[PDB]
Design a protein around this ligand. Structure first.
Ligand SMILES: *[C@@H]1O[C@H](CO)[C@@H](O[C@@H]2O[C@H](CO)[C@@H](O)[C@H](O)[C@H]2NC(C)=O)[C@H](O)[C@H]1NC(C)=O
Ligand SMILES: N[C@@H](CCC(=O)N[C@@H](CS)C(=O)NCC(=O)O)C(=O)O
Ligand SMILES: N[C@@H](CCC(=O)N[C@@H](CS)C(=O)NCC(=O)O)C(=O)O
Ligand SMILES: *[C@@H]1O[C@H](CO)[C@@H](O)[C@H](O)[C@H]1NC(C)=O
Ligand SMILES: *[C@H]1O[C@H](CO)[C@@H](O)[C@H](O)[C@H]1NC(C)=O
Ligand SMILES: *[C@H]1O[C@H](CO)[C@@H](O)[C@H](O)[C@H]1NC(C)=O
Lengths: 440, 152
């Protein structure tokens, strides 16, 4: 018996660069699944929203209010510290937790069986940097990361993938998540006086751009300082409606990465649909995953109701009166076997719960235009062609295949600057001079 | 002393500690599972109730992002030096870690990844069992760890 309406969850912080694009995109796909009668099936899929102020407390307390409400799924957290704890209350209520902005390389494991990840695993950027570094041959990197659950799990991977190529991370500098403009200066001064100039930065996007506004005004970004940035930096730009060309002057040589997505007419009509909406045009490509995840619910919601006649619940100071979701691991099992093609190309999940084709569009920032100096893929790694071409090929592992365009490093140089710089710390260079008696 | 427990799963402990916070308290003798101790140190940070652990030993808890988590046991950061002093005392220099995949395992060994770099050693292969460990997952692991490059 197909009911009147089904309720899914939505945990995403409204007051950030991801959520202000996510909230129309979830509202957009909700309007299309109630317009598409092939997936409607007499059911009005309304989506209960539940914001959070990016804190671990009221994220869970809002989601416990979602679990007191009846749900069948929950469009997951993107904060990735909420996504640990909610994937303990979704590991005991058997509710599938489909994240769109997780990017945490420990959530795809067997201790979290109900945490499916629609975005690409952050485990692959730390390969794509560890393919980018041994491409240029720098081999000694000093990392900078916010000390959240996303940093300490992220740069622990890059410590390990660089160990296979005999590279290493020298000094895991770590900003505190509540950071003013003083704790950034106390740290970025203390890493100028060290042995490397290849900075990986992996910071949350809202306070992420305030790292470079300290690095410019400290004299760091100059000749001989390679800045590599992960996905937050294009999300810090593309969430702004137009690049204001002062922040672009801060970013002169920083080799950022970005989630590559193959184009189609479905994504093309969505971009014109996005121009029809205008939430100040903060199109930052996480809304492209947030528009995907509602379809990935709804198409899996469609297939599950051709088998099951009806969803089923139960009943279990403030007591534990939360309604558990009976018969959920069957509904979780059909979502892993999905072969849907959303707006971001094909969707498939292998045994490691990753999405099947991770591809990163490298980009350089040298002028006022971000030009894409290559494409990283899981398949080949560092092409210059669009990485959908090589997917039918055999995996070609050649040194002539790992190839990139002209890269402009900071200081307006274009030869790859040497990483090592001798430190100015309390140790002096102990030159050992012999004490000659003959032939002085 | 109001006694509440978890059953070593993180779900009912945070519900049960929220019952302690639904109750009025002036302190809280902290958890020791340290998957609990991350979440309860986000409910202590919004209720200003001091959380004092005795069995935390998770070397990412002693940070200023958690202003209300004082640790009365020895910080596990000071144990991973003692292995990294014992290894360079024997001169073994290459070590295959085995850790449960809790927060005491990843943050525990990522410290040993860091401290062995300062003495120019390294960890070969961070093998990682799941939290609910069968006696078949350990055989599936430790067969594939005999076939590697280190014995320490
Ligand atoms: C990313 O690429 C690697 C390399 O091919 C994939 O690893 C392979 O996975 C299949 C089954 O998943 C195994 O049979 C192969 O032996 C693996 N190859 C290697 C070299 O390990 C990996 O699965 C890819 N990721 C995704 C999400 O598809
Ligand atoms: N928590 C963020 C909002 C959401 C967010 O961006 N979370 C991080 C945690 S991992 C993220 O998704 N980062 C993507 C990345 O840098 O790879 C904030 O401080 O506003
Ligand atoms: N969580 C444990 C019981 C409590 C416990 O022992 N927690 C661990 C994880 S922090 C601990 O105290 N470890 C101390 C140590 O290994 O140094 C269990 O499996 O039931
Ligand atoms: C998914 O679909 C593609 C073509 O649409 C097919 O080649 C592939 O085998 C399918 N995978 C499945 C059914 O697991
Ligand atoms: C967090 O930010 C929100 C939105 O700006 C605002 O309500 C307030 O400053 C904070 N909320 C609380 C009380 O945590
Ligand atoms: C402990 O008992 C609980 C009931 O509170 C039940 O989940 C199980 O038998 C035990 N749980 C664990 C994981 O120890």
């Amino acid at each position: 018996q197909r009911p009147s309406s089904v309720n899914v969850g939505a945990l995403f912080t409204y007051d950030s660069f991801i959520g202000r694009a996510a909230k129309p995109a979830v509202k957009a796909a909700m309007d299309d699944v109630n317009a598409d009668q092939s997936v409607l099936k007499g059911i009005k899929l309304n989506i209960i929203f539940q914001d959070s102020n990016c804190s671990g407390f009221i994220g869970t307390m809002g989601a416990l209010q979602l679990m007191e409400n009846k749900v069948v799924a929950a469009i997951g957290p993107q904060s990735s510290g909420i996504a640990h704890m909610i994937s303990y209350v979704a590991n005991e209520l058997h509710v599938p937790l489909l994240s769109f902005g997780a990017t945490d390389p420990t959530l795809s494991s067997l201790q979290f069986p109900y945490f499916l990840r629609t975005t690409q695993n952050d485990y692959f950027q730390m390969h794509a940097i560890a393919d980018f570094l041994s491409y240029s041959g720098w081999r000694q990197v000093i990392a900078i990361f916010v000390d959240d659950e996303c940093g300490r799990n992220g740069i622990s991977v890059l410590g390990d993938v660089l160990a296979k190529k005999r590279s290493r991370i020298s000094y895991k500098a770590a900003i505190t998540p509540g950071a003013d403009s003083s704790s950034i200066r106390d740290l970025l001064v203390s890493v100028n006086l060290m042995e490397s100039r290849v900075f990986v930065v992996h910071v949350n996007p809202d306070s992420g751009l305030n790292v470079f506004s300290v690095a410019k005004s400290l004299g760091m970004m100059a000749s001989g300082y390679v800045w590599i940035a992960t996905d937050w930096l294009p999300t810090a730009m593309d969430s702004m409606e137009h690049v204001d060309s002062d922040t672009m002057d801060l970013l002169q040589g920083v080799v950022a990465f970005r989630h590559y997505t193959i184009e189609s007419s479905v994504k093309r009509q969505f971009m014109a649909r996005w121009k029809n909406l205008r939430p100040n045009d903060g199109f930052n490509s996480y809304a492209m995953y947030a528009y995907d995840s509602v379809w990935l619910v709804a198409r899996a919601l469609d297939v599950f109701f051709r088998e099951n006649n009806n969803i089923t619940f139960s009943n279990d100071i403030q007591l534990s009166a939360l309604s558990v979701f009976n018969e959920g691991e069957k509904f979780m099992k059909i979502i892993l076997g999905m072969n849907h093609t959303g707006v971001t190309g094909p969707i498939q999940f292998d045994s490691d719960r990753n999405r099947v084709n991770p591809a990163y569009e490298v980009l350089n920032l040298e002028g006022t235009a971000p030009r894409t100096v290559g494409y990283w893929s899981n398949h080949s790694g560092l092409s210059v062609v669009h990485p959908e071409t090589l997917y039918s090929r055999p995996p070609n592992t050649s040194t002539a295949n790992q190839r990139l365009k002209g890269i402009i490093y900071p200081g307006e140089v274009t030869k790859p600057p040497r990483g090592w710089v001798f430190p100015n710390n309390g140790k002096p260079l102990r030159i050992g001079v012999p004490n000659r008696v003959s032939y002085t």
